[PDB]
Design an enzyme around this catalytic site. Structure first.
Site, mmCIF file in Angstrom:
data_model
loop_
_atom_site.group_PDB
_atom_site.id
_atom_site.type_symbol
_atom_site.label_atom_id
_atom_site.label_comp_id
_atom_site.label_asym_id
_atom_site.label_seq_id
_atom_site.Cartn_x
_atom_site.Cartn_y
_atom_site.Cartn_z
ATOM 1 N N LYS A 113 4.861 0.073 8.244
ATOM 2 C CA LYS A 113 4.366 1.371 7.783
ATOM 3 C C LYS A 113 5.513 2.397 7.936
ATOM 4 O O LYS A 113 5.946 2.713 9.048
ATOM 5 C CB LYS A 113 3.106 1.799 8.547
ATOM 6 C CG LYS A 113 2.566 3.183 8.134
ATOM 7 C CD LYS A 113 1.259 3.569 8.843
ATOM 8 C CE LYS A 113 0.851 5.001 8.578
ATOM 9 N NZ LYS A 113 -0.471 5.360 9.182
ATOM 10 N N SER A 139 -0.736 9.186 0.939
ATOM 11 C CA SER A 139 -0.074 10.438 1.252
ATOM 12 C C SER A 139 0.864 10.325 2.468
ATOM 13 O O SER A 139 1.919 10.967 2.457
ATOM 14 C CB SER A 139 -1.076 11.586 1.356
ATOM 15 O OG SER A 139 -2.040 11.353 2.369
ATOM 16 N N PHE A 140 0.517 9.460 3.461
ATOM 17 C CA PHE A 140 1.309 9.196 4.672
ATOM 18 C C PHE A 140 2.753 8.701 4.364
ATOM 19 O O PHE A 140 3.733 9.148 4.970
ATOM 20 C CB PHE A 140 0.587 8.154 5.552
ATOM 21 C CG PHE A 140 0.332 6.816 4.884
ATOM 22 C CD1 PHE A 140 1.255 5.784 4.983
ATOM 23 C CD2 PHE A 140 -0.842 6.585 4.174
ATOM 24 C CE1 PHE A 140 1.038 4.570 4.336
ATOM 25 C CE2 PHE A 140 -1.080 5.344 3.563
ATOM 26 C CZ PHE A 140 -0.142 4.350 3.653
ATOM 27 N N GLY A 144 0.795 -1.211 0.000
ATOM 28 C CA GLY A 144 0.000 0.000 0.000
ATOM 29 C C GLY A 144 0.824 1.255 0.000
ATOM 30 O O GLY A 144 1.964 1.265 0.447
ATOM 31 N N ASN A 145 0.243 2.305 -0.540
ATOM 32 C CA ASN A 145 0.806 3.641 -0.658
ATOM 33 C C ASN A 145 -0.281 4.604 -0.259
ATOM 34 O O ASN A 145 -1.471 4.250 -0.177
ATOM 35 C CB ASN A 145 1.178 3.937 -2.115
ATOM 36 C CG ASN A 145 2.560 4.510 -2.289
ATOM 37 O OD1 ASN A 145 2.769 5.728 -2.466
ATOM 38 N ND2 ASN A 145 3.540 3.641 -2.152
ATOM 39 N N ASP A 154 -10.903 9.032 10.928
ATOM 40 C CA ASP A 154 -10.861 8.584 9.532
ATOM 41 C C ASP A 154 -11.284 7.137 9.365
ATOM 42 O O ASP A 154 -10.560 6.331 8.761
ATOM 43 C CB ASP A 154 -9.481 8.816 8.940
ATOM 44 C CG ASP A 154 -9.423 8.776 7.436
ATOM 45 O OD1 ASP A 154 -10.493 8.929 6.789
ATOM 46 O OD2 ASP A 154 -8.313 8.620 6.899
HETATM 47 C C1 LIG Z 1 -1.252 3.670 8.202
HETATM 48 O O1 LIG Z 1 -2.029 2.784 7.451
HETATM 49 C C2 LIG Z 1 -1.832 1.487 7.740
HETATM 50 C C3 LIG Z 1 -1.945 0.576 6.740
HETATM 51 C C4 LIG Z 1 -1.779 -0.757 6.947
HETATM 52 C C5 LIG Z 1 -1.489 -1.189 8.204
HETATM 53 C C6 LIG Z 1 -1.295 -2.611 8.498
HETATM 54 N N1 LIG Z 1 -0.914 -3.028 9.631
HETATM 55 N N2 LIG Z 1 -0.800 -4.384 9.693
HETATM 56 C C7 LIG Z 1 -1.137 -4.869 8.551
HETATM 57 O O2 LIG Z 1 -1.164 -5.977 8.184
HETATM 58 C C8 LIG Z 1 -1.463 -3.816 7.701
HETATM 59 N N3 LIG Z 1 -1.864 -4.112 6.533
HETATM 60 N N4 LIG Z 1 -2.133 -3.260 5.694
HETATM 61 C C9 LIG Z 1 -2.630 -3.714 4.509
HETATM 62 C C10 LIG Z 1 -2.759 -2.774 3.541
HETATM 63 C C11 LIG Z 1 -3.277 -3.139 2.355
HETATM 64 C C12 LIG Z 1 -3.690 -4.407 2.129
HETATM 65 CL CL1 LIG Z 1 -4.361 -4.686 0.568
HETATM 66 C C13 LIG Z 1 -3.576 -5.355 3.102
HETATM 67 C C14 LIG Z 1 -3.046 -5.007 4.310
HETATM 68 C C15 LIG Z 1 -1.371 -0.273 9.218
HETATM 69 C C16 LIG Z 1 -1.537 1.055 8.997
HETATM 70 O O3 LIG Z 1 -1.448 1.951 9.987
HETATM 71 C C17 LIG Z 1 -0.721 1.695 11.157
#
Ligand SMILES: COc1ccc(C2=NNC(=O)/C2=N/Nc2ccc(Cl)cc2)cc1OC
EC number: 2.7.11.26
Length: 336
Positions: free
Chosen positions: A58, A39-40, A36-37, A147
């Protein structure tokens, strides 16, 4: 500072545990990939060398002038429905090592939507109930997520476990302190935010949760629009025009959903999606709603036979807003 080696490319970092005493840990991971991508910054999926365990990393730009608010908030959180901060380290970039969760409500809802189908109500109940628990928990500390949206709701398809993520907008709301009205994402924003209020409360998260519930029931967002005006029109079309009192506070439901939608799902929405912020159910009251009664049934199983995840291990912190609700929340079979 980090070190690179090849066992396969390996990254070794000295990281600080997310919770507890500051006892640095050497953490080695491999097989990193972008998941994932935004703005953060970016989210990676990596594999811990020793255990083979998957984690999410992250990585965000670190402002040297101040401590990262997301980090400080996450260091204090410990709940089954909130993504766990295992470690954190610097690269300046802040890297949050979190538990890895395979899916999101966004991707799941989209798979169904594209196939012109709807997520079975059992999953809607399980997901929404868990979302409300995470909110009851954060709100008990005075923390508002700000959010709530399907992309911030992680989910384990097999265990039916939901975990709230992305504390980048989260903030402790203090009565009398103004807060920015420009937080919260399109289609999930409470009407008071659309109206530009800076005196809003944590109930903005309840409105957002109601939008997610309605979307999971409908197969599409319930209040779409590319502008605030368009969003308010969509809201007015369902709730009716707000009264002068309702405006001051902010400062046919049955026809909305598909024929066989459970009446309790509809009633729940109508109690979340209210103009008056104080009139909305609190998260803990939402958990106690009759739409979730099936989850309190001693014989409930996931469609695939597996057991439901933990649902009644409420703490005193979690119940603090209204302790007597434990009466409904903790079913007799859970009291042995
Ligand atoms: C800041 O945004 C975040 C995004 C993902 C996670 C995240 N944490 N643990 C995970 O497994 C995460 N997985 N994110 C994620 C993102 C996209 C997909 Cl398709 C699947 C999992 C945590 C975040 O904030 C702390």
């Amino acid at each position: 500072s980090m070190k690179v080696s090849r066992d396969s490319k390996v990254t070794t970092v000295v990281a600080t545990p997310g919770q507890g005493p500051d006892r640095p840990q050497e953490v080695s991971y491999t097989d990193t990939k972008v998941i994932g991508n935004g703005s953060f910054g970016v989210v990676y999926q990596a594999k811990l060398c020793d255990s083979g365990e998957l984690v999410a990393i992250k990585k965000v730009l670190q402002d040297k002038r101040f401590k990262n608010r997301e980090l400080q908030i996450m260091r204090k959180l410990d709940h089954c429905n909130i993504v766990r901060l295992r470690y954190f380290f610097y690269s300046v970039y802040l890297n949050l090592v979190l538990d890895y969760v395979p899916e999101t409500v966004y991707r799941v809802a989209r798979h169904y939507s594209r196939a012109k189908q709807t997520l079975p109500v059992i999953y809607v109940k399980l997901y929404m109930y868990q979302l409300f628990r995470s909110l009851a928990y954060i709100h008990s500390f005075g923390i508002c997520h700000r959010d709530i949206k399907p992309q911030n709701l992680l989910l384990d398809p097999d265990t039916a476990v939901l975990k709230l993520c992305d504390f980048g907008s989260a903030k402790q709301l203090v009565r009398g302190e103004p807060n920015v009205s420009y937080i919260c994402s399109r289609y999930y924003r409470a009407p008071e935010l659309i109206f530009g209020a800076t005196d809003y409360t944590s109930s903005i998260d309840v409105w957002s949760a109601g939008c997610v519930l309605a979307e999971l029931l409908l197969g599409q967002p319930i209040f779409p629009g590319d502008s605030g005006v368009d969003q308010l029109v969509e809201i007015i079309k369902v709730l009716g025009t707000p009264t002068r009192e309702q405006i001051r506070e902010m400062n046919p439901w049955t026809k909305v959903f598909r024929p066989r939608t459970p009446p309790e799902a509809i009633a729940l929405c109508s109690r979340l999606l209210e103009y008056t912020p104080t009139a909305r159910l609190t998260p803990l009251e939402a958990c106690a709603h009759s739409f979730f009664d099936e989850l309190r049934d001693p014989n409930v199983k996931l469609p695939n036979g597996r057991d439901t995840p933990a649902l009644f291990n409420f703490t005193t912190q979690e119940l603090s807003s209204n302790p007597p609700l434990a009466t409904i929340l903790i079913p007799p079979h859970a009291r042995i």
